[PDB]
Design an enzyme around this catalytic site. Structure first.
Site, mmCIF file in Angstrom:
data_model
loop_
_atom_site.group_PDB
_atom_site.id
_atom_site.type_symbol
_atom_site.label_atom_id
_atom_site.label_comp_id
_atom_site.label_asym_id
_atom_site.label_seq_id
_atom_site.Cartn_x
_atom_site.Cartn_y
_atom_site.Cartn_z
ATOM 1 N N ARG A 154 0.807 -1.214 0.000
ATOM 2 C CA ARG A 154 0.000 0.000 0.000
ATOM 3 C C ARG A 154 0.843 1.268 0.000
ATOM 4 O O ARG A 154 0.282 2.369 -0.030
ATOM 5 C CB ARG A 154 -0.933 0.013 1.217
ATOM 6 C CG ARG A 154 -1.914 -1.151 1.273
ATOM 7 C CD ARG A 154 -2.880 -1.138 0.097
ATOM 8 N NE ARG A 154 -3.607 0.124 -0.004
ATOM 9 C CZ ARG A 154 -4.680 0.433 0.718
ATOM 10 N NH1 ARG A 154 -5.161 -0.425 1.609
ATOM 11 N NH2 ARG A 154 -5.274 1.608 0.553
ATOM 12 N N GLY A 185 -4.160 9.384 5.060
ATOM 13 C CA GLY A 185 -5.157 10.266 4.481
ATOM 14 C C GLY A 185 -4.623 11.650 4.179
ATOM 15 O O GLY A 185 -3.428 11.820 3.921
ATOM 16 N N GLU A 196 3.230 -0.217 -16.505
ATOM 17 C CA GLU A 196 3.303 -0.096 -15.054
ATOM 18 C C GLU A 196 4.525 -0.805 -14.480
ATOM 19 O O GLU A 196 5.201 -0.261 -13.599
ATOM 20 C CB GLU A 196 2.019 -0.643 -14.429
ATOM 21 C CG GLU A 196 1.851 -0.309 -12.959
ATOM 22 C CD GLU A 196 0.514 -0.770 -12.415
ATOM 23 O OE1 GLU A 196 -0.238 -1.424 -13.168
ATOM 24 O OE2 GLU A 196 0.216 -0.479 -11.238
ATOM 25 N N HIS A 236 -6.497 6.488 -39.684
ATOM 26 C CA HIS A 236 -6.796 7.899 -39.477
ATOM 27 C C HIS A 236 -5.641 8.662 -38.836
ATOM 28 O O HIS A 236 -5.847 9.782 -38.358
ATOM 29 C CB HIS A 236 -8.059 8.054 -38.626
ATOM 30 C CG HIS A 236 -9.275 7.414 -39.223
ATOM 31 N ND1 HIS A 236 -9.855 7.863 -40.390
ATOM 32 C CD2 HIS A 236 -10.025 6.366 -38.808
ATOM 33 C CE1 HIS A 236 -10.908 7.115 -40.672
ATOM 34 N NE2 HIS A 236 -11.033 6.199 -39.728
HETATM 35 O O1 LIG Z 1 -2.738 -2.302 -12.946
HETATM 36 C C1 LIG Z 1 -3.250 -1.266 -12.635
HETATM 37 C C2 LIG Z 1 -4.057 -1.201 -11.333
HETATM 38 O O2 LIG Z 1 -4.800 -2.412 -11.179
HETATM 39 C C3 LIG Z 1 -4.930 0.078 -11.336
HETATM 40 O O3 LIG Z 1 -5.320 0.433 -12.656
HETATM 41 C C4 LIG Z 1 -6.175 -0.046 -10.456
HETATM 42 O O4 LIG Z 1 -7.173 -0.772 -11.166
HETATM 43 C C5 LIG Z 1 -6.749 1.311 -10.048
HETATM 44 O O5 LIG Z 1 -5.687 2.165 -9.624
HETATM 45 C C6 LIG Z 1 -7.777 1.201 -8.942
HETATM 46 O O6 LIG Z 1 -8.689 0.126 -9.240
HETATM 47 P P1 LIG Z 1 -9.468 -0.597 -8.025
HETATM 48 O O7 LIG Z 1 -10.352 0.457 -7.388
HETATM 49 O O8 LIG Z 1 -10.220 -1.759 -8.560
HETATM 50 O O9 LIG Z 1 -8.418 -0.975 -6.983
HETATM 51 O O1 LIG Z 2 -5.249 14.423 -38.462
HETATM 52 C C1 LIG Z 2 -6.318 13.887 -38.481
HETATM 53 C C2 LIG Z 2 -6.851 13.339 -39.796
HETATM 54 O O2 LIG Z 2 -7.412 14.427 -40.532
HETATM 55 C C3 LIG Z 2 -7.847 12.178 -39.523
HETATM 56 O O3 LIG Z 2 -7.744 11.706 -38.184
HETATM 57 C C4 LIG Z 2 -9.306 12.531 -39.810
HETATM 58 O O4 LIG Z 2 -9.804 13.370 -38.774
HETATM 59 C C5 LIG Z 2 -10.194 11.291 -39.917
HETATM 60 O O5 LIG Z 2 -9.732 10.476 -40.995
HETATM 61 C C6 LIG Z 2 -11.650 11.648 -40.122
HETATM 62 O O6 LIG Z 2 -11.777 12.342 -41.379
HETATM 63 P P1 LIG Z 2 -13.064 13.252 -41.630
HETATM 64 O O7 LIG Z 2 -13.145 14.323 -40.599
HETATM 65 O O8 LIG Z 2 -12.945 13.775 -43.056
HETATM 66 O O9 LIG Z 2 -14.248 12.306 -41.598
#
Ligand SMILES: O=C[C@H](O)[C@@H](O)[C@H](O)[C@H](O)COP(=O)(O)O
Ligand SMILES: O=C[C@H](O)[C@@H](O)[C@H](O)[C@H](O)COP(=O)(O)O
Ligand SMILES: N[C@@H](CCC(=O)O)C(=O)O
Lengths: 657, 663
Positions: free
Chosen positions: A32, A123, A537, A553
């Protein structure tokens, strides 16, 4: 952070037996918080232990508990042979989210240069700055930058302005908490009150264990309001008793399974070896020590990965009947009817628990037919998301104490929603304050990175989904398909674990890399997100999860022959789309590792590195596809010389800001 | 990938002028990317143009249009001085899919060695395998690996097997498309129909521009189903002279005319004797409409790249987005595109925003203010995942579809998904005539001008502003929100000048680029209104700089991602003066505690953080729900400057599709 104190009343312990009990207690709580530690005990080297309760010794050091364990030993002033018939010692491991993890900032804090009052705090005090200015004007000098010091300098201020010469230690602590704002779990020790401890909580866990070969005077301590033999918990005929203050149950199960979970504003106080609460139920813990031991594994994370065949079975125990294909979650029996009359599901959680919602969102939409929304708790709060009386809000929290998830819960309750807790800790805040809930029953999770909690939450949400549709004729076959998958899931997990050595080999090809992209879609969007978080992590590599449908995209520009890539391609309805993403990667000279099904001969022939997992139901396959990424993160961390149980810069369960 | 054809009917032009017109057309179509181009035109050097109508010459070449232009004028047997009273020329830029880039695989594809029929094509014919086998059994030999050649061979098969000697060019093409499968935009030319053109499309844009000094018969062309007389087609009334321009993008037409017809799926448009009719296998028809596009909007001007232009012109593009829609005189908003539907929208119970890429980030960037001002649930969905999950949609949902191009497949399929379930659909687009603008119940043109750069810059901020304006419409009847609306609208009034202020810090961003020049990763952290800023900036740096930038929600650091922080990992944090300020400060202390030394984008007047942080990008303060526009621009410029330092061409796409099928 972690709290642990050992009070032996007329149970002779040498100064070594005590320090080895404080350290051993912190080892149970180290997960912890392991940025710094400290202990507080009685100094002096007088054979008569009575003439030593007027001298408080503090040994605090930076690092994990093992750094403090050596600092305590090999000291030239402390004689570890003095026998104490009565003694109190307090300990604390700190998660230093701010400032430096220096010994001055570690606990126990002190109130002056002679240690008249020392406190250990879990806390935050939201008004310690105001308290700091008030105490400085009266003549108190501060040394540390921690909000805990204002609690020590204040319990002394209430002592320096008392009305009677013998105001109880409780009255002093009571006046303090009345000036403290925010959450806290406190354990006090003072030279003026030798052997007396005081434990008060408010929004932070704090229990009290008890052991004694004699009979106890009661099993229901009556809470008091501003103390005779029909009021305190103590041994009847004799005085032999041992108390165990602690912020968690793992630090006490090894010594006894009889604790008294306090409540908000309950001011417990051990006086003359008698426990009395001011302002309970002495109960047996339902936990075996084996549950918090590494067993034959070298790490907790490895144990908890390879035990997922068992923890999955325990999650379904007494709830899934495969002979008649029925699902019954006792925690929801009185509410399942009203849940079905609601109009939307909201899943709120942090980190890996949020990914569990992403991993089950699709099947929840399919079997309930309701809109399902999945929210990161921190952003949920920032936006003041609209919530209504006919919303059902789920709160996924392994610990049941996560700050942001818990604040989201109280937010949804204020708006009249029906709240459901999916937790792995009984008696946690989230389990208590929700209208109903389900304990996933995966056993304690000691590793900082959640593994079995994720797969157990996954299964728990699927079982709920199965209840929500058990009256639909058109969905009966779909239910059977899923439940047969659950019956076969434990063994298929064992099959995945048998590829441990094949994963370790691929890790030897990646440990030197700086980045890795993990790509998946559909049911395996959560898989690539959770795998990226795990690799972040514990390995500290820059791994990112990318929705496969989004490659075209923009993010695909980042792929070349030098960028490592992991793709998830399973035999479900998105298979052809996943094959197109794979072809786009290859066109960019990418050489990805592909997690695919064993029977996917096409993919296996055209790809060099493949991780072949057995086929399950499409809405359960995410459990099998994530395990290789758990194993990969583990082996990568080992190859890079890092510890898988104590990743840098954090600890387990975010219970503060 | 690019189609352009020019038909002069009784407008005398020399061969040189025709060829210079075709080349210039393709130059407006290069920005989409290509690997080869070609032109088709009448050959022969008979001074009487009427006799040269039976000799189609082709000039196709792999490489850039400039190389093609050199090949055109480098023809010793060709006389560029012949005057044509009537002529049809066609041009094409190819993005290879079937068949490797080469002269033979370049368009126009021909039907035989005498060039009796030629065709230019955008798209892919799925069943080109089956069609190729059939035509081979009938005695037609293929010379290219392109799916397009099946089209040219098939139309000659229909001509060879015609029932009457005078079957129309349209009828032949109709029979062709009825056998094709997939997506296509096509223009046909033939020696058997001199001076005539046929254009048709299915799932690919095709438009027709028209110019004439004489009055035109109509501005609404009626559809003809299977009589072509003076009441059913488009033509100059009192004289013959007219010019037609077929194109797949309005950018190739706007310099000649702004009167265009957008064709729809399975339309077959034909020009016969200088008259345009539209065939199709109350009364439906196609409108001749006026485009507000100008040639200057698709030229670099004094800027060295389109990316640089479109970033630095954002003060003007934001103003164009608000023109005619925001009255600062009395604090009123009016989106005319929603007039006939705003009433229904306000009776719905949920908003769903569906988009891809940066357009999705526009929804994330405005989700909060939409929730605040509509008080409705707002769900933001990536179009691809939306489809994979079969997301529940209901008749009382309002679904928004954000798309600069208005053609993205997943967004468009999300639209058709929601229409089938009875939802009210709304298009937020930047391309007139696009599929998403047509098929939605209503919509708003963000009016940012054409986006020629590879990355979305002004489109993102114009979408941002457009959604804020919609939110301002939804609450215009709430007494309790009057103050909040005024505050937001005074922020929009001041926004153009605040953008200029941010752009004046370009030098400071260049200094940051030199610091990150050698770095391989960077983490961009933010929360609340600036979560979208982190995601969008991370995407820009990935797309333009090719380094691993990642957006991290600040509230999630302690849940795992904080483990990446150390003295070596570059970090950019956004800390603005809004209600999340204290939480952002907390995240900064968490990073510093772990040896992180982040660059902070913050308010000009945040004296505390500026002193405690070494490098800070200091932007001016605005309304909290508008700050995202100011905080993202430094990340746009950072991606731009990093790419330049590394020798990349910011106007070069790179991101190619799957490899070429050689077969
Ligand atoms: O591997 C990452 C940890 O598991 C972390 O993402 C955790 O899930 C959250 O910090 C709190 O989640 P809980 O409330 O379930 O403990
Ligand atoms: O840099 C971002 C690009 O422009 C690309 O992420 C684009 O936003 C998507 O391909 C959606 O294209 P449209 O907005 O034309 O649907
Ligand atoms: N499929 C055709 C046309 C592709 C295009 O440019 O759209 C080819 O490869 O020749």
């Amino acid at each position: 952070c972690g709290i642990f104190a050992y009070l032996n009343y007329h149970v002779p312990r040498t100064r070594r037996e005590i320090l080895e009990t404080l350290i051993k207690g912190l080892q149970r709580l180290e997960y912890r918080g392991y940025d710094s530690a400290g202990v507080g005990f009685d100094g002096g080297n007088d054979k008569d232990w009575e003439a030593n309760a007027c001298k408080i010794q503090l040994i605090k050091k930076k690092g994990k508990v093992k750094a403090l364990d050596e600092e305590v030993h090999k000291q030239q002033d402390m004689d570890l042979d003095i026998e104490f018939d009565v003694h109190l010692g307090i300990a604390h491991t700190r998660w230093a989210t701010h400032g430096e993890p220096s010994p001055v900032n570690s606990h126990p804090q002190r109130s002056d240069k002679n240690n008249e009052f020392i406190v250990i705090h879990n806390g935050i005090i939201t008004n310690y700055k105001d308290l700091k200015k008030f105490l400085e004007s009266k003549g108190y000098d501060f040394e540390s930058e921690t909000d805990t010091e204002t609690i020590a300098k204040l319990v002394k201020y209430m002592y320096d302005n008392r009305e009677s010469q013998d105001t109880s230690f409780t009255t002093l602590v009571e006046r303090v908490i009345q000036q403290l704002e925010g959450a806290f779990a406190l354990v006090f020790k003072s030279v003026h009150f030798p052997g007396q401890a005081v434990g008060t909580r408010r929004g932070s866990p704090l229990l009290i264990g008890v052991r004694s070969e004699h009979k106890l005077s009661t099993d229901h301590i009556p809470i008091l309001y501003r103390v005779d033999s029909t009021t305190c918990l103590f041994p009847v005929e004799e005085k032999a008793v041992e108390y165990y203050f602690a912020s968690d149950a793992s630090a006490v199960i090894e010594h006894t399974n009889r604790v008294i979970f306090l409540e908000d504003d309950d001011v417990a106080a051990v006086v003359d070896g008698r426990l009395s609460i001011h302002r309970r139920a002495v109960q047996t813990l339902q936990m075996e020590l084996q549950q918090i031991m590494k067993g034959n594994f070298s790490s907790f994370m490895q144990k908890e990965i390879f035990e997922q065949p068992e923890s999955v079975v325990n999650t379904m125990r007494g709830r899934v009947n495969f002979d008649d294909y029925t699902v019954n979650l006792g925690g929801l029996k009185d509410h399942i009817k009203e849940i079905q009359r609601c109009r939307r599901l909201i899943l709120i959680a942090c980190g890996t628990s949020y990914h569990a919602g992403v991993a089950t969102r699709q099947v929840l939409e399919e079997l309930t037919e309701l809109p399902v929304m999945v929210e990161l708790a921190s952003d949920f709060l920032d936006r003041n998301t609209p919530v209504f009386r006919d919303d059902v809000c789920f709160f996924l929290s392994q610990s049941g104490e996560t700050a942001d998830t818990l604040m989201g819960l109280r937010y949804c309750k204020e708006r009249g929603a029906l709240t459901v807790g999916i937790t792995n800790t009984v008696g946690s805040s989230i389990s208590r304050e929700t209208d109903c809930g389900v304990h996933i029953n995966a056993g304690p999770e000691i590793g900082v990175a959640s593994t079995k909690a994720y797969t157990s939450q996954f299964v728990s949400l699927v079982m709920f989904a199965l209840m929500m549709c058990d009256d639909r004729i058109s969905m009966q076959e779909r239910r059977k398909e899923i439940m047969l998958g659950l019956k076969r899931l434990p063994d298929l997990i064992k099959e995945v674990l048998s590829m441990d050595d094949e994963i370790q080999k691929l890790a030897t090809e990646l440990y030197h890399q700086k980045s890795v992209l993990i790509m998946g879609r559909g049911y395996h969007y959560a898989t690539c997100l959770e795998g990226a978080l795990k690799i972040k992590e514990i390995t500290y590599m820059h791994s990112e999860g990318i929705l496969a449908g989004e490659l075209k995209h923009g993010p695909l520009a980042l792929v070349d022959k030098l960028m490592p890539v992991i793709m998830i391609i399973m035999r479900d309805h998105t298979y052809a789309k996943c094959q197109n993403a794979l072809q786009q990667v290859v066109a960019r000279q990418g050489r990805p590792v592909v997690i695919c099904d064993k029977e996917d001969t096409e993919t296996i022939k055209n790809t060099k590195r493949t991780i072949k997992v057995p086929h399950s139901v499409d809405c359960l396959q995410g459990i099998l596809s994530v395990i290789p990424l758990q194993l990969l993160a583990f082996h990568l961390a080992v190859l890079r010389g890092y510890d898988v149980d104590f990743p840098r810069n954090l600890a387990k369960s975010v219970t503060v800001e």
